[PDB]
Design a protein around this nucleic acid. Structure first.
Ligand code: NI
Length: 142
DNA sequence: TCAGCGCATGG
DNA sequence: CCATGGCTGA
């Protein structure tokens, strides 16, 4: 079992690893959006949308106005509905193949949800900080 | 390759 | 004020 450690950077992925869907939802929330804005909205979403089954069948207009202050409301809204639907339906392995999930959300999955972390090469800053911090203190862990 | 989605905040 | 905080469809 992998179970990624918590860093000083405190990425939201650090507490979302045990729920691949929730982590992947967080990545979507972080597209062209600061963590300061996105993260609190993520929680208000998660309380009203705890599962991929709940988000699968849902009113995409009803998530949209919740994503309003962030921007990209109906874009993400219809995207999440499909992704959550695509989540519980298809067979995947690596998450990229799911709609709305590109390289970033995949690198997050590969690092946090499984142990590829040594192999994975990050793009995003936050991920790269965590990844570089890993190679340093990993011997002090396991 | 690339427009396009989108509001908030910092420079 | 005009930058900047991923991904798809095409
Ligand atoms: Ni995808």
């Amino acid at each position: 079992k992998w179970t990624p450690p918590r860093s000083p950077f405190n990425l939201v992925q650090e507490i979302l690893f045990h729920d691949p869907w929730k982590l992947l939802i967080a990545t979507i929330f972080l597209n062209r959006t600061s963590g300061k804005m996105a993260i609190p909205v993520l929680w208000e979403f998660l309380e009203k949308y705890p599962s991929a089954e709940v988000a699968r069948a849902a009113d995409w207009r009803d998530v949209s106005e919740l994503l309003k202050p962030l921007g990209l409301y109906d874009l993400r809204a219809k995207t999440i509905i499909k992704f959550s639907d695509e989540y519980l339906t298809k067979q995947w392995r690596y998450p990229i193949e799911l709609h709305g999930i590109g390289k970033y959300g995949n690198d997050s999955y590969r690092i946090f949800c499984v142990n590829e972390w040594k192999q994975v090469h990050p793009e995003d800053h936050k991920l790269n900080k965590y990844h570089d911090w890993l190679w340093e203190n990993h011997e002090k862990l396991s």
